[PDB]
Amino acid sequence: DGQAVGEKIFKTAGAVKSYSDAEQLCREAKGQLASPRSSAENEAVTQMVRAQEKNAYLSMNDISTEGRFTYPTGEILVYSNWADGEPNNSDEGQPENCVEIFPDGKWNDVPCSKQLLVICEF
Ligand SMILES: [Ca+2]
Ligand SMILES: [Ca+2]
Structure with missing residues (x-):
């Protein structure tokens, strides 16, 4: 399903x-x-976040080069939907290398230790 x-x-x-x-x-x-x-594709993921009532992880991260968000291939973003003022690399000053998606479809950078909804693609 999905x-x-x-x-x-x-x-x-x-x-x-x-x-x-x-x-x-x-x-x-x-x-x-x-x-x-x-x-x-962003709207399809957002519908599942609204149904489950929990922010989800996306795959993309900047662990290699700070501020360059990439896929599991290592290629650069071809699409983005950042919330106003994001990404800011600041969890009260601490590093934020991973990405969450809100129920309104906007994105925010977060610490990679945060517990979030798991959505997979096939
Ligand atoms: Ca970062
Ligand atoms: Ca942030």
Whole structure:
């Protein structure tokens, strides 16, 4: 089941995990973390966040080069939807290398230790 755009399918079982535990769960299922590359893909992920009532991880991170957000291929973003003033690399001054998506579809950079909804893509 889940939500689809073109050949891409998004699914969740309601699991709530850290970034590294979320990545392991999606890879064990033979997929990867949600990686919305267009407005239409972003809207499909956002509908699932609203249904589950919990912010979700996206795949993308800046662990390599600070301020350059990349996919699991290591390629640069082809699409973004940052909330006003994001990304700011500031959890009360502390580093924020991972990305959460809100129920309004906007994005915020977070610490990779945060516990969030797990949404996978296939
Ligand atoms: Ca950062
Ligand atoms: Ca932030």
